[PDB]
């Protein structure tokens, strides 16, 4: 049963684990923050 | 493959209280001899004598 609750850990464990990496992907995906970014500074300049 | 370890800790409480029941019926029945053989000739001969 400790043995159980061990391997239990480690399932949480890889969770977080890919849960960071999918917000890694999120982050690197192609339409950003930084695209977004661009986006708006050119529109509202040209906008104004 | 949680899950899998759980029904084995079931199964491992199976065999625990199997060899509680050999232990109580090991118990019962050296009980049942000890009371159905009742008093033995040694004490019938001391009352009688």
Known sequence: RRE????????????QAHTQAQLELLQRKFTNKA?????????????? | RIQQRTVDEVDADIAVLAESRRS???RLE???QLYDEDINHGEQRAMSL
Do not use: H
């Open chain 1, 4 to 15: 159980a609750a061990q391997m239990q850990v480690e399932y949480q464990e890889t969770q």
């Open chain 1, 35 to 48: 695209l977004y970014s661009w986006m708006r500074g050119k529109l509202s300049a040209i906008y104004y």
């Open chain 2, 30 to 32: 050296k009980y049942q």
């Open chain 2, 24 to 26: 109580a019926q090991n």
